[PDB]
Design a binder for these strands. Structure first.
Lengths: 79, 204, 62, 190, 87, 137, 108, 174
RNA sequence: AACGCGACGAUACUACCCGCACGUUGUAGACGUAUAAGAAUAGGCUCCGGCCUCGUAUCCUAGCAGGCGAUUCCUCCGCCGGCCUCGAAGUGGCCGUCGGUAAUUCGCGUAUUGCAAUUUAGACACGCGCGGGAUCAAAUCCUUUGCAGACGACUUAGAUGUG
């Protein structure tokens, strides 16, 4: 396209007050609608979440995991 | 070092347009006389097609009924481009701004009045000190020539002549400096042992 | 039709200018220059060879 | 990721001399002299052994090191051009109108002019001027073929592309009209 | 009309100025460019046309021509110009 | 094969190089932390040249042409000091031109007002001798 | 042949007033002293005298030179510009103008 | 963020007749000051266990400082940050002199690279890599490369910002 | 460009140029208003030894606001001439004369402006005075013309000639 040689009309970034008020109002309205939909919530919710765990690139994954295991063993035998 | 001079001449080669204009405008409003040379050697950051696009948009902006009066006068010379930046940074619609703009002077190339004068540099606007090495830049002279500046070749020829004369002057400077070095050692003995060590102790 | 500012038309005009009109105008220029040339031939300071000074401003008045 | 050091190396033949300025590279050898400016790329030129030159980038990016692979091959191409040279063999074919190729060299500007006549019966002459340092000949080893040789690979290739582009068919069937001048073989003189 | 010649205005001078001389190179022989004359009128001629490819080739065509009286000009001066960044 | 290259000659940062800090001090690099910070130590007996062991940025740092030949990486204060007096860093820093300029600057700054007249007068005498010498040539 | 200068003041430039973004206060002026770059350099000249010297049309008591006296009060910002208080506010046409900064009263 | 130090906090549920001598929970955190340290400790304890600020007390808060702030160490930080998609894990490596410096650099780098903020970043485990072969990231590998020496090309000189005009064009070589 | 510029002709008066007596004359603002290489910045400079972050450098800087006189000095500065040089909005060098001139040292004066009060001191521009050289003009109105024209404006012509 010949944009460099024959530029077209610029698009103003100067925000009008009418636009700022409208966008703020509609942002607030969307937030309230999201809150009401979350109140509705026709979806299940669980207690425990999927913990991704220690990354495979951790230098001490083996040590941490065996620490955890001996902790479980100790807790089980003590309790 | 915050020094006041009568008139300071700024060599425009390798200087960023906006930053040099900022420094120059602040100096003009503080009361310092500025003479900017080599406005065609000035630089603009970004790339040349971006600069040319901006100038073509500037050309697009024009008054309808009467282009003669009230319209944006699109000056194509690099000195006028730099002057446009400085004027946009100075409150030109006041008496104070008019006085500052009267303190400002700009030229293309280095006229013979200013070729024998000292040209200062602004490290706060230098391209090689400011831009990252991998970044692109364009030349105000090239932009002016591609928008319609008619006198690129004349200024180039005059700069060639000035550089030849400067080379002759620099050969003379070599002769003078060599003679000065020989003169210093020659009277290094004929002087006074005390004075010599006295200067060494006092830092000269 | 091709415009008067077409690149190919300009190349054709350049070829024509270089091949025919060039020689013709050079010959006529030689003849007229010869005629006008024939019609024409029909101390430094006190001699003028040393070019010296005869008889707003660019610099700020000090 | 700002690699601390990246290095490249270019070997040189015994019978060549490389003189490299700030970023001007000049190479001399049996075939001639080639010079090129590489001031647009950040590189430190160095010597590591008797007959190998070194190119390095400190604190650079992948774009920077990619420039170092291009800078090497360009310098290597110049070395090969000054050692063995470059040569493009091109062939012109036709169906009904023989393509007449006239190659001459003008004393002024010292360049080679190639004139193409009778390209599918056109009455227009097509004149192409070579880049300086390029020799063009109609060799009597095969018919309907031309050899364009020189020191600079860029110049030789650009000239060959110039003839190929100037002999282009317009407003016809590509599948039917098979006339033009095409690059057939690419290589070195030696 | 044409926006090239508009705003339409009286000529600032009666003589009329050249505004552009042909570009000069040292190779050509030394010559003058322009001249002056006074328009006397117009008359009619005929020309044994020798224009190839035309319908009036090798025929006689009546054309209108203008006459400008051109008494010899007298040279009284010599002006030297220089090139500057301002023109 | 003939090669002629004149591109650059930088000063590198490695273990054992001494560098100058804007306090005017000197510190040798013990460990290189990142590409723009190093760990340095100045064990110099001169109080003006002494620098506590710690992290210094290369932006504040300035590279001097003195390198301790085989200073081990990670050398603690006592050993870097042993290398400092073994190599005589103070003498070579004094011989370097940067310290000479610093000393000239210090003398000129500490030079008082009577001393400023004395310098003016003595430079006038030396100037007279120098002009006599220059007139002959 | 003394061929030497006779200056005993430090050059300064009246820049503007102490002002906000809109409101300007002519009471105190901003002075840029020649050679001052930081607040310590300013702290040296706190308390020193300052004079604005200008030329008038009429000679009143033997001269056309009229002077407005004041003193440096406190540093301004971080660039060594100082605030100054004069017996009368400066003419406001002397923005970017010269003032003479005198070393008295002295403490060194 | 800011200037940080190690803060190790022990706090416990307020003693009652039902459960005297409670568990005395402890954890080490990074805060600019002790008030923020205690607030973060209570927030984390509320998130983990069913103990709140009102029903608890702070047994001890002490500043853990570095054992050896003078020797260069490599640190591996495992952290969890929540963005618009959810919670994500990262292991990142930093070459510093202290765990405090490592955490400072980690906050700065996470803000720069992912726009993650203080309450969006969780510090799960910061460790000191006891030796090489424990470094997994190429930048710290090239930092620990043998006989590491490099120049500093294009060094912009440090000129005073009040030195508006210079007489000579500056050099960027030393 | 009617508030952009250049070249040239003639410039009566007025006073056009030259020297100082200056001005109770003006100036967005003297007070050492001192300082010409070019070019690169992942390089450069050089006397070819070497040097380069750093103009916090170089020059100049003493004398009743800078007096008078000496020993000693051939160094610096300015005005006029001669030979050349500088045209991008025009200058500098060489020689010469003439005047001034602490690199060293000394003598005779400074007082009283009274404990500070801009140390009225520079440049360009403008104006009044003398005494030296010189110059001795145009335009508009009026009449006329018609290559012009709403009115102005414009092209022409009126001094002894091709009027």
């Amino acid at each position: 396209a010949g944009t460099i040689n024959k530029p077209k009309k610029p698009t103003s970034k100067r925000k009008t007050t009418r636009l700022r008020a409208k966008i703020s109002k509609r942002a607030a309205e969307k937030k309230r609608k999201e809150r009401k939909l979350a109140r509705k919530n026709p979806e299940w919710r669980s207690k425990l979440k999927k913990d991704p765990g220690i990354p495979n690139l951790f230098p001490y994954k083996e040590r941490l995991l065996q620490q955890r295991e001996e902790e479980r063993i100790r807790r089980k035998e003590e309790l | 070092m915050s020094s006041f001079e009568s008139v300071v001449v700024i060599d425009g080669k390798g200087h960023l347009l906006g930053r040099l204009a900022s420094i120059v405008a602040k100096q003009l409003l503080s009361g310092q006389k500025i003479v900017v040379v080599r406005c065609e050697a000035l630089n603009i950051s970004g790339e040349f097609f971006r600069a040319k696009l901006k100038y073509h948009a500037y050309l697009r902006k024009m008054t309808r009924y009467n282009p003669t009066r009230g319209g944006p006068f699109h000056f194509r010379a690099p000195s006028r481009i730099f002057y446009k930046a400085v004027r946009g940074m100075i409150p030109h619609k006041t008496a104070r701004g008019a006085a500052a703009l009267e303190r400002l002077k700009v030229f293309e190339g280095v006229p013979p009045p200013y070729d024998k004068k000292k040209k200062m540099v602004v490290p706060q606007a230098l391209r090689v000190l400011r831009l990252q090495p991998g970044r692109k830049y364009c030349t105000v002279g090239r932009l002016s020539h591609e928008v319609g500046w008619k006198y690129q070749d004349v200024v180039a020829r005059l700069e060639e002549r000035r550089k030849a004369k400067g080379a002759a002057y620099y050969e003379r400077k070599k002769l003078a400096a060599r003679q000065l070095s020989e003169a210093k050692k020659a009277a290094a003995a004929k002087v006074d042992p005390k004075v010599s060590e006295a200067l060494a102790a006092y830092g000269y | 039709a091709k415009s008067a500012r077409a690149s190919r038309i300009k190349e054709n005009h350049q070829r024509f200018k270089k091949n025919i009109a060039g020689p013709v105008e050079a010959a006529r220029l030689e003849r007229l220059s010869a005629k006008l040339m024939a019609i024409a031939q029909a101390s430094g300071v006190k001699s003028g060879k040393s070019i010296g000074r005869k008889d707003s401003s660019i610099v700020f008045p000090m | 990721m700002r690699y601390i050091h990246s290095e490249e190396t270019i070997p040189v033949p015994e019978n060549l001399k490389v003189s490299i300025k700030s970023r001007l590279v000049t190479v001399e050898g049996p075939r001639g002299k080639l010079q090129k400016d590489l001031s647009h790329i950040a590189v430190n030129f160095s010597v590591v052994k008797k007959g190998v030159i070194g190119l390095e980038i400190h604190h650079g990016s992948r774009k920077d090191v990619a420039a170092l692979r291009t800078v090497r091959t360009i310098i290597n191409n110049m070395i090969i051009g000054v050692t063995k040279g470059f040569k493009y063999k091109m062939r012109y074919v036709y169906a009904h109108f023989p393509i007449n190729v006239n190659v001459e060299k003008n004393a002024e500007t010292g360049c080679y002019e190639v004139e193409i006549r009778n390209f599918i019966g056109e009455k227009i002459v097509r004149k192409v001027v070579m880049a300086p340092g390029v020799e063009v000949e109609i060799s009597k080893a095969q018919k309907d073929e031309l050899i364009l040789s020189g020191n600079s690979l860029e110049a030789v290739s650009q000239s060959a592309a110039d003839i190929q582009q100037i002999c282009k068919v317009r407003n016809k069937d590509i599948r039917k009209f098979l006339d033009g001048i095409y690059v057939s073989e690419k290589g070195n003189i030696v | 009309g044409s926006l090239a010649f508009l705003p339409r205005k009286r000529a600032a001078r009666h003589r009329g100025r050249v505004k552009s001389f042909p570009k000069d190179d040292p190779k050509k022989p030394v010559h003058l460019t322009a001249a002056m004359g006074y328009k006397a009128g117009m008359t009619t001629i005929v020309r044994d046309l020798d224009r190839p490819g035309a319908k009036a080739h090798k025929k006689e065509v009546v054309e209108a021509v203008t006459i400008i009286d051109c008494p010899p000009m007298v040279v009284v001066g010599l002006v030297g110009y220089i090139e500057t960044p301002r023109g | 094969a003939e090669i002629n290259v004149e591109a650059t000659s930088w000063r590198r940062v490695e273990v054992g190089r001494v560098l100058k800090l804007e306090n005017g001090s000197l510190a040798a690099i013990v460990e290189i932390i990142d590409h723009k910070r190093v760990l340095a130590d100045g064990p110099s007996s001169d109080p003006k040249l002494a620098t506590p062991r710690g992290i210094v940025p290369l932006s504040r740092a300035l590279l001097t042409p003195i390198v301790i030949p085989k200073l081990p990486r990670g050398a603690r204060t006592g050993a870097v000091k042993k290398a400092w007096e073994a190599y005589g860093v103070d003498a070579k820093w004094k011989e370097t031109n940067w310290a000479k300029k610093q000393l000239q600057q210090e003398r000129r700054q500490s030079l008082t007002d009577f001393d400023r007249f004395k310098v003016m007068r003595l430079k006038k005498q030396r100037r007279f001798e120098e002009r006599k010498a220059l007139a002959k040539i | 042949p003394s061929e030497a200068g006779h200056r005993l003041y430090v050059k300064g430039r009246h820049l503007s007033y102490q002002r906000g973004r809109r409101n300007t206060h002519p009471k105190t002026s901003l002075i840029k002293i020649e050679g001052v770059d930081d607040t310590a350099a300013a702290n040296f000249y706190l308390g020193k005298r300052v004079a604005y010297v200008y030329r008038a049309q009429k000679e009143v008591r033997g001269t056309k030179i009229r002077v407005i006296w004041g003193k440096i009060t406190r540093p301004h910002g971080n660039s060594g510009v100082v605030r100054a208080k004069f017996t009368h506010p400066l003419p406001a046409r002397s923005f970017g103008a010269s003032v003479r900064i005198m070393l008295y009263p002295s403490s060194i | 963020m800011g200037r940080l130090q190690e803060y190790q906090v022990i706090g416990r549920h307020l003693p009652t007749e039902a459960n005297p001598n409670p568990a005395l929970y402890r954890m080490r955190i990074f805060a600019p000051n002790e008030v923020v340290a205690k607030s973060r400790f209570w927030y984390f304890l509320r998130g983990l266990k069913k103990v709140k600020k009102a029903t608890g007390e702070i047994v001890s808060v002490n500043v853990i400082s570095e054992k050896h702030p003078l020797k260069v160490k490599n640190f591996g930080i495992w952290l969890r940050y929540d963005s618009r998609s959810g919670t994500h894990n990262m292991y990142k490596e930093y070459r510093e002199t202290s765990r405090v410096a490592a955490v400072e650099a980690m906050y700065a780098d996470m803000a720069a690279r992912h726009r993650a903020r203080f309450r969006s970043i969780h510090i799960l485990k910061v460790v000191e890599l006891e030796k090489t072969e424990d470094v997994k990231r190429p930048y710290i590998k090239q930092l620990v490369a043998k006989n590491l020496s490099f120049p500093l090309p294009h060094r912009v000189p440090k000129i005073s910002t009040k030195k508006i005009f210079s007489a000579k064009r500056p050099s960027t070589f030393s």
